[PDB]
């Protein structure tokens, strides 16, 4: 049953326009301030330096209240802009200062004045960043493996970590004063003559200073609100501002006690986190679970105003941005922050937890129609039908939202990783598809991207690449007589690179703990205050590291091709295939056709599906061998953000028929046009993979022609498709519902399609802000009907 | 049976004249070099920065070979001068640049050029020293306790740690190449995917770089030797310089294989240690045990040359110097380095270990007659009579040498602190009187000086001092009715300050580990290479921290006076005594007389000797409660260097009759002229203290009139005095044998007595280089006869 969606107030349109009409730029205030503070704390421990720096920033950072805002708090003067974080890395910025506004995608403006002020910043931070210490900790062998174009650990290397869902619920209940009082109590409790207390004390004091600075920050908006009110004409806007001033004053240090207060305090928590560090994927998680109580108890609010407040937060979540270097930008195209917000699911007791706020979140997506937040819904055996159908309506809107997650697979997967059953049932998603128990984890849910297809090249070329032996010298492909020998060489190549990728991640882990322990963020994740340790030092109850494998379909299709055509049927000799591949099928399209016609993943053909499964398993098993410095384990992920295009441009021709330089498959999805047996057959193939071991998450994309979702019948079919895929143990699925014509038009006349939103992989983005190479990949994806 | 001493070669007199005619100065080379290197290693981990800095220093530090030297290696161009160590502290130097000349005590010259060059040094190291981080780690309350004249933790706060006896024996056998290969083997052993290996690898690589730098340092001298030889006329000196070149070449990286090579390699090890850090008390320890094998196996050497070589080392040990701030200089007056070298004793099997070299060491002291090294002898039940008598002859020479140590007390004391019986039996002395198992310890043997008399003052004034409550507000003295109430208040004051002294020590401990881990020094102490941890990080097998209590006699005499005169006989009320003390006995000498006539420590009077024991035990028991960041325990020591005088000037009048500002007693010695019952009665009193608990060492001074050691009979009396004191469980004892008239003359005409050496406390010094206040204290010490 289609119910349709309500309409947003005019204010929502005003606010939305602010985001879309904004010209993304790089501001310099924060960079100046943090450098300023660090110059004065040279003789203080890192944790105190971080606390004092946050304090200096929050007391001097410019304060902005955009016109018509109900929820205030902006990190940059210009909307949808980015601050700078010199503490992690900055030389890349110094190199790109003049070509930032010359980008085809993810372009950023920067005044001549800002360029001038950053000079001193670059000068001071030379050798004092986390990225430089990280490099120093790595062995020479690891530094080389890092530059072989097999994997990339740049995410946490060039910028902050993030990828966490803080315990918003706790802070909303006790406010910043509560966090302070808790730290003060621990300080009293653990007082001791034991040397260990020395460092624990500095950590706790750092937490106090941080939350105190947070209280100052909120008060600053409180004062600014009045100054605007006193000089605003119409009593309506004046009245709203006086309310804002009043609300900010209360949630200044106290906990929320009304829905409005809860919304504002929630935003300040989220905002401050993004000022302390620029790691993205700061996910609100189960927003409907911790916000509902405040909605239910507020006896003076109307559902209309409650909805408007929510719509404002949806818009504020879009105001945050982050500038990355040229290369990294290809890994995260479309100004993505990946702030995942999930709705629905079950509670810790195993009962359904759908509530009104669950539905208001879905409604907001339609009211705002912006890339953020990354709206998601949890599905389980007892998911109410109305809820799943309502999510289906949203999907039909063509925003790529929401992403669907299967409780039936994730819960068991999390418990096997060490979470209690209660914590597992209460999971939220971080960034793209990474599950975690909110308020208790330091997951590092995206510590690297690993190119699986690249390993196939190395196996065929015995570790030799370009003009150097970059990987182990495994058995020559030419001398192989069985597929087993190929699989052993494949595993040997896999083992070597996974080892160095993880080792590299651990050096970066150490660097962050050594130069950038986060006092503020740590105060909201369990055990940090109790243990007197930061997140970087293992204070979290649960600790993980999550590296992503990219090219699942390419690996499955390649292995079956080598197995069937070379070793089984002997149509080609190893020596012939190797030459053909190294030559990119030049003067040998007969062999390419033979490869392209081989069985392909995504058609419910077990012979290939099982090799895609096994190929991925070799990767996942290698990752499970590793441990991080925080005492946690590494767990495999299979998602790609937008790196499948970049990775593909660095990979030669592969045994599945793909020509050199072409994009790799996205997530665990079948390759372009290879899934020619319908949506269902494709879901059956994907569900054959091991979605339990890849506990860091797997991503599955599917694109339907609009006609497939028309009418109630269309909604019914989408629900069946989803349920059927999840019953077979699928991890996640999300859908694009657009006509190819609209996308093509967008490429011709961007000006006319500024509000066009499309799903990339785990997140939605403004289509015209994506590089052409990413746009084309999306356009080329298989299009299904039901 | 006196045997007199042989005569040194003319060369020794020439080398000796170099030290005495030198004018101590502060050079700037090292300061410039380490600063330059640190600017280039900003992005490296601390351990690597320290390794690279040592490398840069050793490759560019001026090389110097003084005339007629047989053993080469000089740390400063000008003899007996000091290099600078900005990494620990340096602001104090900036403040004293212009008054280093005007000193009455340890005066240092500094060129106008050096002053200019240090400007950059001061500017760069701001906030980057160990002292600044140490302060930052301390709490508010601890910082205050540190600045109220009760104790001082300045030693390891302003400069390096040191106070260690490296495993010289090992390096002499395997050479620097041996250490390097051992580190390389460990690197291959421990190599694993475990995150912990990351930091261990950096440490081991740091060790390699350091030993490699040490190798090139030795080679630079090899090259310089020739460069000089090619420019010297008389074939005799030319031949020596060519021989020096050969030796430095072999010993360059390999172990010694002749007495000469052993002597030269020994000095290089010692010298380089003093280039990496300026922590003093770098003690050669059992020189006779590890040097004897090389002497015995050398078949081409004569005892005359072997002795000359030893005399050369003796002179070289006097070439090293260290500048300290005005205040610290009062704690360590006389240009002291406290390099303790000990001979005799038993081996790990419990058999006597006296050997030929044991005697050559004693002989060397008479040949050179300089303040260093701090010669000592080990004495036990089976010590050969000839040996003890020969040591007695040396004592008669009046150099203050040698210090005597009782194996019968020390061995048991060390075993109770955790050392195996074998390690304890192989102890050597660090600095003044601090015992340790060489090559396996990080003892921190002089982490602080605690003023015991000051606690008595705070007990009487209820923690109120000057114009503020600095200590606990213990029971008001005026309302005390029994001695028990007094002791309880005394313990309460003691507890409070010992707690903060130790906590402060722990913060400094952490600071050194965080900013100054030593790669080179650590490589020669057991478990460091094996554990992949530096000395500062707990790599040593044995770990301790040793704070010194000062004013034992003053505490004993004060407690018996309060007990007897006030509580037992009621001659005066508490209120009256308190008033009289705060008034420094003004217009109440009748009361002072009464206090001075009360029983005094040092006369074999149990009533007072026991309160001296008990008063000291309160201090010792408090210290035992604490542990350091390296997993070790704190152990009490009772010695004062020269701080008894400084501490005295900061202490008001005390209940024993001592007027405000007067020196406190030295070590465990009776106060000036209170021991009026002969040397034996004094020894009996001191032996009543608990010398086992004060495992960090106790110091006992005694001064005899020259007539007491005249003739063989005099030598036998001294042997019996020593035997009796040790049989009664005394820890240590040393004697000054000098005529009062000579010291007074030296004060009147310094120029005439430049070679006059006298015993301060645990070390001998050049009398004229000592400040007048310290000179007078020594002159005022009780003079005994036998």
Distance CA A502, CA B549 (A): 52
DSSP alpha helix (H) spans, B110-167 = 112-124, 130-137, 140-146, 155-158
Nearest partner of B552 among B493, B623, B601, judged by Cα = B601
The secondary structure of B486-528 as a DSSP string is HHHHHHHHHHHHHHHHHHHHHHHHHHHHHH---HHHHTTSTTH
Bridge partner list, A352: A346
Q: Which of B211, B263, B312, B432 is catalytic?
A: B432
**Closest alpha carbon within chain A to B38:** A127
SS (H, E, C) A593-629: HHHHCCCCCCCCCHHHHHHHHHHHHHHHHHHCCCECC
The secondary structure of A427-494 as a DSSP string is -EEETTTEEE-TTSEE--TTSEEEEHHHHHHHHHTTTEETTEE-S-----GGG--SHHHHHHHHHHHH
- Considering only CB atoms, which chain B residues are within 8 Å of A203? none
Q: Who among B43, B132, B136 is closest to A48 (CB)? A: B136
- Considering only CB atoms, which chain B residues are within 8 Å of A44? 133, 136
User: By the 8 A CB rule, do A734 and A669 touch?
Assistant: no
What does the block give as tokens for B260?
Answer: 């000469």
Burial of A531 (0-12, 13-18, 19+ CB in 10 A): middle
Q: What angle do CA A139, A141, A147 make, to 5 degrees?
A: 110
- Considering only CB atoms, which chain B residues are within 8 Å of A498? none
Query: Alpha-carbon torsion A418, A423, A425, A429, what sign?
Result: negative
- The residue among B136, B203, B508 with the most chain A CBs within 10 A of its CB, best to mutate, is B136
End-to-end CA distance of chain A: 18
Distance CA A654, CA A635 (A): 27
Q: Map residue B703 onto helix, strand or coil.
A: strand
Nearest-Cα distance to chain A for B511, in Å, is: 9
What does the block give as tokens for B497?
Answer: 């300050």
CA-derived radius of gyration, chain B: 26
A627:B194 CB<8 A: yes
Q: Who among B44, B136, B506 is closest to A136 (CB)? A: B44
B133:A499 CB<8 A: no
Residue pairs spanning A and B at CB distance below 8 A: 82
Please name the helix (run of DSSP H) or strand (run of DSSP E) that holds residue B733, with its range, or none: strand B732-737
Distance CA B175, CA B191 (A): 25
Distance CA B664, CA B661 (A): 9
- Considering only CB atoms, which chain A residues are within 8 Å of B514? 45
Nearest-Cα distance to chain A for B733, in Å, is: 35
Burial of B587 (0-12, 13-18, 19+ CB in 10 A): exposed
- The residue among A45, A195, A203 with the most chain B CBs within 10 A of its CB, best to mutate, is A195
B199:A510 CB<8 A: yes
Nearest-Cα distance to chain A for B328, in Å, is: 22
At B413, phi and psi to the nearest 5? Answer: -60, -40
Residue labelled with tokens 């200073």: A209
Q: Who among A194, A198, A510 is closest to B137 (CB)? A: A198
Nearest partner of B764 among B742, B744, B737, B740, judged by Cα = B737
Nearest-Cα distance to chain A for B123, in Å, is: 12
Q: Who among A48, A133, A628 is closest to B195 (CB)? A: A628
Q: Who among A195, A626, A628 is closest to B628 (CB)? A: A195
B44:A202 CB<8 A: no
What does the block give as tokens for B253?
Answer: 């990286």
| Residues of A engaging B, defined by a Cβ cutoff of 8 Å | 41-45, 48, 126-129, 132-133, 135-137, 139, 193-195, 198-199, 201-202, 499, 502-503, 506-507, 509-510, 514, 625-629
Please name the helix (run of DSSP H) or strand (run of DSSP E) that holds residue A732, with its range, or none: strand A732-737
SS (H, E, C) B382-427: CCCHHHHHHHHHHHHCCCCCCEEEEHHHHHHHHHCCCCCHHHHHCC
Distance CA B510, CA B523 (A): 20
User: By the 8 A CB rule, do A378 and A414 touch?
Assistant: no
Distance CA B409, CA B731 (A): 6
- The residue among B123, B195, B508 with the most chain A CBs within 10 A of its CB, best to mutate, is B195
Nearest partner of A735 among A705, A774, A695, judged by Cα = A705
Nearest partner of A427 among A414, A442, A409, judged by Cα = A414
The secondary structure of B645-673 as a DSSP string is HHHHHTS---TTSPPTTPPPPPTTPPPTT
Nearest partner of A287 among A370, A338, A343, judged by Cα = A343
* Helices A483-515, B196-229: crossing angle, 10 deg rounding: 80
- If you ran DSSP here, which 8-state letter would residue A670 be given? P
- If you ran DSSP here, which 8-state letter would residue A752 be given? G
Nearest-Cα distance to chain B for A88, in Å, is: 12
Distance CA B623, CA B499 (A): 8
At B350, phi and psi to the nearest 5? Answer: 85, 20
What's the topology of domain A8-786?
Answer: Anaerobic Ribonucleotide-triphosphate Reductase Large Chain (3.20.70)
At A785, phi and psi to the nearest 5? Answer: -140, 165
Nearest-Cα distance to chain B for A276, in Å, is: 22
What does the block give as tokens for A730?
Answer: 């699928």
Distance CA B548, CA B449 (A): 5
Nearest partner of A496 among A161, A151, A5, judged by Cα = A151
- Considering only CB atoms, which chain A residues are within 8 Å of B202? 137
**C-alpha B696 chain-centroid distance:** 12
Q: What angle do CA A52, A506, A454 make, to 5 degrees?
A: 130
Number of DSSP helices (H) and strands (E) in chain B, helices first:
32, 18
What does the block give as tokens for B440?
Answer: 């396996």
- The residue among B139, B142, B198, B543 with the most chain A CBs within 10 A of its CB, best to mutate, is B198
Query: Alpha-carbon torsion A506, A508, A509, A511, what sign?
Result: positive
**Closest alpha carbon within chain B to A41:** B127
The secondary structure of B239-308 as a DSSP string is HHHHHHHHHHHHTTTSPP-SHHHHHHHHHHHHHHHHHH---S-B--BSHHHHHHHHHHH-TT--HHHHHH
- Considering only CB atoms, which chain A residues are within 8 Å of B194? 627
Q: How many residues does chain B have?
A: 786
User: By the 8 A CB rule, do A681 and A675 touch?
Assistant: yes
Bridge partner list, B547: B448
Nearest partner of A239 among A254, A251, A220, A226, judged by Cα = A226
- If you ran DSSP here, which 8-state letter would residue A25 be given? B
Dihedral of CA atoms A678, A679, A685, A688 in degrees, nearest 10, equals -150
CA-derived radius of gyration, chain A: 26
Nearest-Cα distance to chain A for B267, in Å, is: 34
Q: Would you list the domain boundaries of chain B?
A: 8-786
**Closest alpha carbon within chain A to B128:** A43
Please name the helix (run of DSSP H) or strand (run of DSSP E) that holds residue B441, with its range, or none: strand B441-442
B42:A201 CB<8 A: no
Please name the helix (run of DSSP H) or strand (run of DSSP E) that holds residue A375, with its range, or none: strand A374-379
- Considering only CB atoms, which chain A residues are within 8 Å of B628? 195
A193:B499 CB<8 A: yes
**C-alpha A715 chain-centroid distance:** 28
A510:B44 CB<8 A: no
Nearest-Cα distance to chain A for B281, in Å, is: 26
User: By the 8 A CB rule, do B600 and B671 touch?
Assistant: yes
Distance CA A85, CA A38 (A): 13
Q: Who among A44, A137, A195 is closest to B136 (CB)? A: A44
Q: Which of B434, B442, B541, B622 is catalytic?
A: B434
Nearest-Cα distance to chain A for B190, in Å, is: 14
Distance CA B612, CA B110 (A): 46
A45:B132 CB<8 A: no
A625:B201 CB<8 A: no
Entry resolution (Å): 2.5
Distance CA B312, CA B66 (A): 12
Write out the catalytic residue numbers of A. 432, 434
User: By the 8 A CB rule, do A339 and A372 touch?
Assistant: yes
B136:A499 CB<8 A: no
Q: Give the technique used to solve this structure.
A: X-ray
Distance CA A247, CA A155 (A): 37
User: By the 8 A CB rule, do A439 and A473 touch?
Assistant: no
* Helices A552-561, A606-623: crossing angle, 10 deg rounding: 120
Q: Who among A43, A195, A629 is closest to B136 (CB)? A: A43
B128:A43 CB<8 A: yes
For strand B403-406 and strand B448-451, is the pairing parallel, antiparallel, or unpaired?
A: unpaired
Distances in Å between the Cα of B691 and the Cα atoms of A561, B448, B620 are 84, 19, 10
User: By the 8 A CB rule, do B623 and B634 touch?
Assistant: yes
What does the block give as tokens for A715?
Answer: 């909604």
A132:B48 CB<8 A: no
Distances in Å between the Cα of B432 and the Cα atoms of B166, B338, B638, B642 are 17, 6, 11, 11
B45:A137 CB<8 A: yes
């Amino acid at each position: 049953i289609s119910k349709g969606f309500s309409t947003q107030t005019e204010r929502i349109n005003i606010l939305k326009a602010q985001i879309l009409n904004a010209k993304p730029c790089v501001e310099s205030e924060r960079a100046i301030l943090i450098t300023e503070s660090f110059k004065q704390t040279e003789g203080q421990p890192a944790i105190l330096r971080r606390a004092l720096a946050l304090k200096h920033i929050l007391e001097n950072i410019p304060i902005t209240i955009r016109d018509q805002e109900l929820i205030v708090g902006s990190l940059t003067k210009e909307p949808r802009s980015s601050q700078v974080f010199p503490e992690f890395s900055n030389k890349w910025l110094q190199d790109e200062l003049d070509r930032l506004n010359k980008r085809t995608g993810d372009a950023f403006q920067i005044s001549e004045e800002s360029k001038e002020k950053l000079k001193d910043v670059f000068e001071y931070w030379n050798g004092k960043t986390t990225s430089e210490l990280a490099t120093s900790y790595m062995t020479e062998e690891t530094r080389e493996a890092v530059n072989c174009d097999v994997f990339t650990v740049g995410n946490y290397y060039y910028n902050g970590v993030g990828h966490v869902s803080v315990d918003y619920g706790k802070v909303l209940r006790v406010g910043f004063n509560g966090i302070i009082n808790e730290a003060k109590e621990q300080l009293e409790k653990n007082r001791s003559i034991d040397p260990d207390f020395i460092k624990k004390e500095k950590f706790l004091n750092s937490v106090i200073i941080s939350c105190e600075a947070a209280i100052t920050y909120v008060n600053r908006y409180a004062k600014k609100a009045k100054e605007i009110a006193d000089n605003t004409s119409d009593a309506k806007r004046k009245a709203e501002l006086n309310e804002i001033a009043k609300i900010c004053s209360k949630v200044s240090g106290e906990g929320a006690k009304s829905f409005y207060e809860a919304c504002q305090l929630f935003w300040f928590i989220h905002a401050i986190i993004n000022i302390e560090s620029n790691g993205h994927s700061i996910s609100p998680a189960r927003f409907d679970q911790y916000m509902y109580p405040y909605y239910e108890n507020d006896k003076n609010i109307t559902d209309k105003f409650a909805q408007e407040l929510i719509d404002c937060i949806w818009i504020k979540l879009n105001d945050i941005n982050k500038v990355r270097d040229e290369i990294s930008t290809k890994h995260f195209g479309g100004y993505p922050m990946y702030q995942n917000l999930i709705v629905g699911g079950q509670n810790s007791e195993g009962k359904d937890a759908t509530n009104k706020v669950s539905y208001m979140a879905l409604e907001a997506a339609v009211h705002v129609k912006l890339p953020q937040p990354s709206l998601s819904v949890r599905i389980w055996n007892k998911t109410p039908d109305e809820f799943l159908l309502r999510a289906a309506e949203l999907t039909r809107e063509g925003l790529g939202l929401p992403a669907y997650y299967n409780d039936e697979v994730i819960i068991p997967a999390l418990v096997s990783r060490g979470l209690t059953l209660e914590d597992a049932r209460d999971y939220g998603i971080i960034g793209c598809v990474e599950p975690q128990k909110p308020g208790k984890t330091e997951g590092w849910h995206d510590s690297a991207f690993f190119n699986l297809a690249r390993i196939v090249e190395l196996t065929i070329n015995s570790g030799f690449d370009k003009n150097k032996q970059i990987g182990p010298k495994t058995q020559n492909f030419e001398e192989m007589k069985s597929f087993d020998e190929f699989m052993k060489a494949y595993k040997a190549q896999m083992e070597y690179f996974v080892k160095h990728m993880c080792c590299a991640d651990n050096c970066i882990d150490i660097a962050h703990a050594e130069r950038a322990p986060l006092p503020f963020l740590s105060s909201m994740v369990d055990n940090c205050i109790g243990k007197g340790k930061s997140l970087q030092d293992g204070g979290a109850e649960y600790n993980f590291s999550g590296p992503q494998g990219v090219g699942v379909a390419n690996i499955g299709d390649s292995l079956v091709a080598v197995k069937k055509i070379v070793f089984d049927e002997n149509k080609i000799t190893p020596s012939e295939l190797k030459k053909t591949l190294n030559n990119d099928f030049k003067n040998s399209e007969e062999i390419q056709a033979l490869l392209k016609n081989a069985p392909k993943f995504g058609n419910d053909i077990d012979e290939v599906d099982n090799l895609a499964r096994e190929g991925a398993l070799v990767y996942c098993r290698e990752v499970n061998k590793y441990t991080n410095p925080r005492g946690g384990n590494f767990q495999p992920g299979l998602y790609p953000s937008s790196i499948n295009v970049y990775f593909g441009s660095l990979t030669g021709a592969t045994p599945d028929g793909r020509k050199s330089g072409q994009p790799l498959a996205d997530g665990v999805s079948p390759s372009r046009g290879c899934d020619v047996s319908g949506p269902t057959a494709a879901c059956n193939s994907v569900s054959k993979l091991d979605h339990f071991i890849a506990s860091n998450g797997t991503l599955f994309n599917q694109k339907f022609h609009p006609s497939a979702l028309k009418g109630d019948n269309g909604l019914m079919n989408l629900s069946s498709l989803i349920r059927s895929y999840f019953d077979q143990k699928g991890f996640h699925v999300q859908f694009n519902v657009i006509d190819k014509k609209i996308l093509l038009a967008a490429q011709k006349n961007p000006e006319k399609y500024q509000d066009l939103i499309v799903r990339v992989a785990g997140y939605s983005a403004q289509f015209i802000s994506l590089d052409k190479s990413i746009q084309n990949d999306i356009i080329a994806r298989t299009e299904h009907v039901m």
